[PDB]
Amino acid sequence: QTLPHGHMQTLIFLDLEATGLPSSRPEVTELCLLAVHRRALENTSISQGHPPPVPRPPRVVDKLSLCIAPGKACSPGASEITGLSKAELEVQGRQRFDDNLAILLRAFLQRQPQPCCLVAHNGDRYDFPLLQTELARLSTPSPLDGTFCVDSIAALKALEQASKSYSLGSIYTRLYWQAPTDSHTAEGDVLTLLSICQWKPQALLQWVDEHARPFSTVKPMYG
Amino acid sequence: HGHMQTLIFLDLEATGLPSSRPEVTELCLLAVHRRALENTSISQGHPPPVPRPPRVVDKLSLCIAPGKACSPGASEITGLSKAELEVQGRQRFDDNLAILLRAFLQRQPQPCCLVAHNGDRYDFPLLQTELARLSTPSPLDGTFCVDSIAALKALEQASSKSYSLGSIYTRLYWQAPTDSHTAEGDVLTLLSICQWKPQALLQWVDEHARPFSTVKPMYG
Ligand SMILES: Nc1ccn([C@H]2C[C@H](O)[C@@H](COP(=O)(O)O)O2)c(=O)n1
Ligand SMILES: Nc1ccn([C@H]2C[C@H](O)[C@@H](COP(=O)(O)O)O2)c(=O)n1
Ligand SMILES: [Mg+2]
Ligand SMILES: [Mg+2]
Ligand SMILES: [Mg+2]
Ligand SMILES: [Mg+2]
Numbered sequence: 455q456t457l458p459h460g461h462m463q464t465l466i467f468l469d470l471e472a473t474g475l476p477s478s479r480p481e482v483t484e485l486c487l488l489a490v491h492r493r494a495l496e497n498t499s500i501s502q503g504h505p506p507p508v509p510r511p512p513r514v515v516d517k518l519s520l521c522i523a524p525g526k527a528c529s530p531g532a533s534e535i536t537g538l539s540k541a542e543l544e545v546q547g548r549q550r551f552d553d554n555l556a557i558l559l560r561a562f563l564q565r566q567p568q569p570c571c572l573v574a575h576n577g578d579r580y581d582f583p584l585l586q587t588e589l590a591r592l593s594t595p596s597p598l599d600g601t602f603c604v605d606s607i608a609a610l611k612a613l614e615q616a617s618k619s620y621s622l623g624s625i626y627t628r629l630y631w632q633a634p635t636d637s638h639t640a641e642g643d644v645l646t647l648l649s650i651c652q653w654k655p656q657a658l659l660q661w662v663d664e665h666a667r668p669f670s671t672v673k674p675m676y677g
Numbered sequence: 678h679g680h681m682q683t684l685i686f687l688d689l690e691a692t693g694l695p696s697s698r699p700e701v702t703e704l705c706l707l708a709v710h711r712r713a714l715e716n717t718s719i720s721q722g723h724p725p726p727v728p729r730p731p732r733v734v735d736k737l738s739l740c741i742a743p744g745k746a747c748s749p750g751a752s753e754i755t756g757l758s759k760a761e762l763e764v765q766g767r768q769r770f771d772d773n774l775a776i777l778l779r780a781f782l783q784r785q786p787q788p789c790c791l792v793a794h795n796g797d798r799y800d801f802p803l804l805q806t807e808l809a810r811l812s813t814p815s816p817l818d819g820t821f822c823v824d825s826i827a828a829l830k831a832l833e834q835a836s837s838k839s840y841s842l843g844s845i846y847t848r849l850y851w852q853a854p855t856d857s858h859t860a861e862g863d864v865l866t867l868l869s870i871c872q873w874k875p876q877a878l879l880q881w882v883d884e885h886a887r888p889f890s891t892v893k894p895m896y897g
Contacts, residue, residue: 547786567766
């Protein structure tokens with residue numbers, strides 16, 4: 455139907471940085487959450503002009519950005535594009551993906567009105583399975599068991615059928631003509647994704663409410 | 678503990694000025710390891726470039742619903758109002774928030790020092806009042822704090838006049854700050870001011886850092 459889990463009251467834009475690609479059995483190095491209330495997205499300035507300017511982020515937003523020490527080193531390509539490395543994260547005292555972090559995420563999620571839906575670019579094939587794997591290792595139950603999730607790649611394809619590449623930067627350089635900034639950083643890509651999702655907010659929320667599925671159904675990437 | 682491993686740059690937005698007994702509407706924490714500040718490029722030239730933020734940083738920015746309304750002036754500069762905060766589902770300054778802060782501080786290597794502009798007279802006393810309203814024990818009992826006004830006064834006399842956040846930033850870097858009077862914006866501006874002479878700041882923090890437990894509440 456059109457509301458399998460009710461109207462999502464907040465979208466949490468999510469991006470992960472990690473040690474490598476899925477085949478490497480990667481581990482999380484950076485995590486950013488940007489929670490936006492439905493109304494903040496609805497009340498975004500309507501897109502007009504060609505090219506429309508990059509929308510202004512909503513004034514009221516909750517943000518969490520964390521660097522995390524992995525158990526194994528980052529691959530060469532990963533370490534260069536993210537600007538992170540196992541050694542640099544450890545020398546700066548970053549802690550691993552542990553139970554305290556789960557409590558942090560739980561407390562952060564608990565400040566958001568429910569139902570809540572995660573939005574990640576390619577999340578169905580990377581971020582969500584990876585985050586599922588990281589949470590599975592913990593004694594603490596998943597803080598996302600009642601949270602829903604959605605892949606923004608699927609979202610924008612459906613939206614752009616208002617009758618092509620759907621990588622983050624390609625979409626960003628197609629709606630707006632500016633280049634994305636701070637690429638391949640957790641907070642950087644989250645802000646880029648937020649700008650993409652602010653292009654057609656009302657249509658995005660409609661598609662999100664339609665396709666939101668429980669994060670508990672996400673298969674772990676490995677383990 | 679006395680040799681700070683983490684600086685947490687902190688900024689609060691609230692409903693009004695101290696006399697009005699205000700409540701917090703927004704808070705931002707930006708945790709930076711001592712190594713990230715130490716390895717910031719010394720400021721050279723006149724004006725020096727705005728220092729680059731460290732790549733490794735922990736950030737927490739939260740909007741908070743106040744019990745009372747924001748004054749018209751406070752809403753004008755912060756862009757926040759009780760009505761819009763509550764219609765967007767923001768929760769009060771409650772025990773879960775203290776649990777959130779606790780877990781955030783737990784991820785930072787100790788000892789840890791809060792850095793806030795005008796903190797001794799505003800942010801730290803106000804934050805002590807919000808936390809004393811909770812049954813949950815204060816999660817800042819054990820962390821240290823310091824006011825960046827006093828810091829920048831000492832660093833600027835070292836060589837050789839307003840100390841508002843904007844004034845300092847503009848005097849040091851010859852341009853206007855961005856996103857003034859927002860929690861995250863003023864934190865990033867404060868970071869830039871503190872990255873001016875980081876070695877000298879860290880040394881000055883170690884000598885003047887003070888336990889948050891000693892901060893006197895603002896009211897109540
Ligand atoms: N050439 C690449 C591209 C991506 N990644 C992995 C590491 C990144 O942390 C993760 C997420 O990609 P992105 O930085 O685009 O968010 O994918 C990688 O290992 N090598
Ligand atoms: N002219 C001003 C300046 C500040 N404040 C209050 C509300 C602000 O949220 C808080 C913090 O000020 P600032 O935006 O400088 O951090 O002090 C105010 O009411 N009126
Ligand atoms: Mg991504
Ligand atoms: Mg990324
Ligand atoms: Mg201030
Ligand atoms: Mg401020």
